[PDB]
Design a binder for these strands. Structure first.
Lengths: 245, 244, 245, 245, 245
RNA sequence: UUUUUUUUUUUUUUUUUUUUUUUUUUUU
């Protein structure tokens, strides 16, 4: 023939090796919540005030969302004046055009070990609170009532069965949140709304920046799982409720 | 890594409940405050605010909030005064902040006046008997207004009455939404309620306009009977909208 | 609670004055055409040659439409420059965005009497011809055969019963015109096509700018209406044909 | 009332000039394309290579379409060098917006005899070839598998009955062609298809550039029309299928 | 009737020599993206390291799309400098404009002998994979979740019915792929979703790039068809799934 | 990333050789 197919066919006798091919996929994957760079801008700009600085931004992401410019107009005058100062201080963005972009939801997503705890303390003020969420699943735990907690769910050191059921329970909250927060997904099918958060959620659970030691010791402290390592009663009934309509 | 440990250490710190609660109240959602729009409305006009507001009210009742676009397709006499009132109050065609003062905002901020006026303007509203009379008969003109969302009460009256009055109200503005939006025309009914459930309930749940006067004004308009049952036009509208 | 809320309840409880309010209601209604302004713009700008300049503009609307840019490239190039010369001189537009906006059809709608006479003198050159109109109805009046006839139909001084017959007869020409001029409208129901031009037509006949006293004398002099105030034979048969699908 | 009421009345009371209005009507009458004009540009700039160059443009519209840039990036490099020169030589525009605008489709339908003769010898290369069209009618003549036969069906010298059959026979090819070529129009009804090419088809039939006498002579030589002046067997069967969707 | 109507028809009646018009029918025919044309650029620019560079591009095509800017903005640091470096050497673009334009999926579609095995190894990392598809067909062939397996569908040496089953079993993956990856294609009928990927499929299958002697040998080695030449049970079980929607 | 937002046409629609589609395609 020629160099047309002979080179192409000759490429095939090379035998693929699993680890190196996996490494390319491991190195080349979707993630938009890089814990490394997201925290550098907070600490480097503010030496000691960053601890109270991150207090303001994270609760803004947990309560209202990411539309900084749209929220500020509908914000209180006292809140808007300082929020814009924080906006100018770091240069926050509303749309995650790039990974290095600083948006409040990543800050919450990068410090979930408190964000979930803050959600427990702030239940009535959540975007989807007990007034609406409790009408879907009985006695739902308030810790899981958050957006950033998805990075705290374990993936190693605990049985995969607990991970699967806890995946289902969290996914139900996303269904309640996504329908309420977005008008487009209102009235859509159960799978259609589920299609909206496969990638960000699966990236959080498989994230390796958090060691598996901190999550397992934190979960048992809040009672979301029992001493034996299985999720609490409220978790499974939430997971079971997701199976049915 | 080192920065992995500080995140672990940061979360182990005991959160301040009263400080966090202080943050939450400041960051709680705030919407159109009818007290501030009246404040700007009252302070700018010393004595003509009574007659200047109703001129803006009828403009929002008849035409949209597009100030500049409506002025170019309107009578010359009306254009001169509207532009003068435009500069006097600093109206904005769109609502970016809570301080923004758009003509439709004034309509919803004074529901009692703006909605009784629409009763006599049956042939002048953007949508009325000329469009939806083929669906319902003897439609009440006293609620053919953009501000009737803030007039329907939920306390002091039975819950079922609130549902049907909301159910009847949705019929008028279902056609209004379909006629007013090019992309929304010919869409599913489920999309009509989904794209409208959020704005409707905010006006209903508002606690600015007193609840006792809501029913009393509605009582004199014939919408609610003396016994407390919705008028015949309410149920027939309720039955018509549910079945497409 | 607040005393200012009590101001709102009293402000709306006062009895509304219907007569004064209705004055506002008519004052804020839309009026897409102002025949005073269309004449005023031409007279003040090019009044030196306004006698001849307006004649070319209207006959263009008589024989074609509003698409200046699309029409300038298809017509003869000997006079295409002059139309483009008149394009910049007066500022014609293809769409009526505002009242100040001027289109060729608007000029025709502002001088209903002359354009009907011009249509009579140029019967063969209209987009719809008497040849297809002859098949529909015999001896159709070429002066009635014009777009701007709607603004010339009388509503006062003549009985309403015969006005509808003239209205129905004119609708036959409009039905043929709008079917030919728009390719998509062909093969449609009789009531649907009649509704595409119904709204502009009723607004045109009810216009107050053109006096009704001069409307009758012009209409009688052109042979459509006899000296007794009754339609001619051609007018009645044209209306009768329209009533039959 | 004011001057504007008087201006409208007095202008219509003026005596119109019959020759002045008649002059404007003829000037504003237009023709889509006179094939004499299109040959003027082609023949003048080409001294002796115009016969080969026209033979190059003619089949490019007959085989690939009226897009110079879109085609040039998806065809042979040997032909791209020459074809790019042809566009620069004649100033070929992609879209025909003016009567002076020159596109390969205009040249394709400006030489009706040679264009559709070429399509007969290249059946497998048409965008709508026998393979995709044999499922609608059996034994369709190759000479009609072209976009220039619309101007080959005559008006004078043949009866109205045979002309209608030829129009209907061609309309079937256009129905397959228009559905295939118009993206926005693929899922349209049968009565909508006839409206899409209603005006363009009758424009070619009524064109006066290409004489009627050669039209009937060309048809009989190609077997389309019988020696006695009647359509061939393949004509009515194509027309019948068009009538039957 | 004119000297120019005659000159237009004089060469339109000339007999056409087939060996000069069909000659200008293959120089103008369609050749889309040509395999071995993209390969040449890879060999000429990175001949010392094209083996390693090609694998990274193929992995990117498998686990991502064509938007190089969108993908690079939400992924790791180390890959971003690596992928951007390979971008300027090889000139990868997100949109294909010509035959010479190279997009990352195109490189992976001209070497299916590797990406099929690569897809099987990384079945967990495909944008659409078994995890969202095992509920459709059990024990699906792992080397199917790739865009290049269709260019190696056999056409000679095997029955046509076998090819249709392989075509159908391949048709299922895009039915899961284009439905999930395209919001517009979501909720589409089975007939129109088939036509979206029908045209690229036939060209890939009918391509003469791959000799069929090695096509079957590689296909046999993957075990989804027996040594007798009939597809394994995994293909036929997919056949039942596709036919009933 | 919604929680009182959406203002469409409203005496306009403007055709008489126009539309050039797919043919290893798109990653929201």
């Amino acid at each position: 023939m020629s160099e047309w197919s002979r080179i192409a066919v000759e490429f095939g006798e090379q035998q693929l090796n699993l680890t190196e091919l996996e490494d390319f996929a491991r190195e080349l994957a979707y993630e938009g919540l890089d814990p490394a760079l997201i925290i550098k801008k907070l600490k480097e700009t503010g030496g000691d005030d960053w601890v109270k600085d991150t207090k303001f931004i994270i609760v803004f992401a947990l309560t209202r969302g990411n539309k900084i410019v749209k929220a500020s107009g509908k914000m209180s005058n006292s809140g808007s004046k300082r929020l814009m100062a924080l906006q100018e201080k770091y240069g926050l963005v509303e749309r995650a055009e790039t990974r290095l972009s600083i948006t409040p939801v990543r800050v919450a997503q990068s410090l979930p070990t408190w964000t979930c705890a803050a959600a427990a303390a702030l239940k009535e003020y959540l975007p989807v609170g007990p007034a609406v969420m409790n009408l879907k699943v009985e006695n739902y735990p308030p810790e899981m009532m958050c957006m950033a907690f998805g990075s705290l769910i374990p993936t190693a050191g605990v049985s995969e069965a607990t991970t699967k059921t806890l995946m289902e329970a969290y996914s139900l909250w996303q269904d309640a949140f996504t329908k309420t927060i977005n008008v487009k997904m209102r009235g859509a099918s159960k799978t259609e709304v589920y299609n909206s958060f496969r990638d960000p959620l699966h990236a959080a659970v498989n994230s390796v920046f958090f060691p598996n030691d901190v999550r397992v010791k934190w979960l048992k402290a809040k009672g979301i799982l029992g001493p034996d390592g299985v999720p609490s009663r409220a978790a499974e009934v939430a997971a079971a409720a997701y199976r049915n309509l």
